[PDB]
Amino acid sequence: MRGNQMLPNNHFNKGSMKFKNWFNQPMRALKRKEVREQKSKICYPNPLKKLRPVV
């Protein structure tokens, strides 16, 4: 270690650590859209969401 820096503190020591990637993000968005649409048919005239209070 040489020169002037903010002293390190990077937590990568643990060999059992898992990584999570997000390559599925656009596809899972499309599935959530298609589930709402079909749910909306099952109860056609009625809104999909209920009324809620203000706090």
Binding site: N4, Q5, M6, L7, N9
Partner: protein, 182 residues
């Protein structure tokens, strides 16, 4: 006799444009403007023109910005002011004197304020129309030393040093200045 002649030559050569410098931007509108000033320099000795041409070649960090009130503070009673940089609004001020600014760029909120109080913004291509003999102009400059990152330059473990340590910070955590004077 000779010693004076020599020094007066050095002083002159220290002002004039170098002619082996060029701006790094790939912007063709910026490179157009430089070409004009370059062709003026090789046909004149006037110090204001030489200063302007040298400043167009400096980096973004060297072209540090100024706020409207600081221009007026440095204008020292002149009517026209010139600035190779961008003019920003000062939220602390509302009324200003009537003034003409020749500069590179201006922010939306600054331009409105300048106009409401009476006054004009012109781009640097128009300088020669705004002024006939460059006697009524002031030239103004910012300072890159005022960046917040300059507080960390140097060593905090020197005696009498005013510099700040690079540190983690929280409600309790953080390294202090301990070798300064108060």
């Amino acid at each position: 006799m000779l010693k004076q002649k020599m020094f007066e030559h050095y002083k002159k050569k220290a002002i004039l444009f170098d002619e082996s410098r060029v701006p790094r931007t790939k912007n063709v509108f910026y490179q157009s403007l430089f070409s004009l000033y370059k062709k003026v320099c090789e046909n004149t000795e006037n110090e204001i023109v030489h200063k302007i041409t040298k400043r167009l070649t400096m980096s973004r960090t060297e072209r540090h910005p100024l706020k409207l009130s600081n221009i007026i503070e440095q204008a020292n009673g002149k009517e026209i002011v010139v600035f190779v940089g961008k003019v920003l609004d000062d939220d602390k001020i509302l009324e200003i004197p009537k003034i003409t600014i020749v500069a590179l760029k201006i922010s939306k909120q600054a331009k409105e304020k300048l106009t409401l109080n009476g006054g004009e913004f012109y781009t640097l291509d128009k300088l020669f129309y705004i002024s006939k003999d460059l006697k009524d102009v002031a030239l103004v400059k910012g300072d890159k030393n005022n960046r917040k990152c300059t507080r960390y330059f140097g060593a905090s473990g020197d005696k009498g040093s005013e510099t700040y340590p690079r540190t983690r910070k929280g409600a309790r955590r953080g390294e202090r200045r301990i070798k300064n004077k108060k």
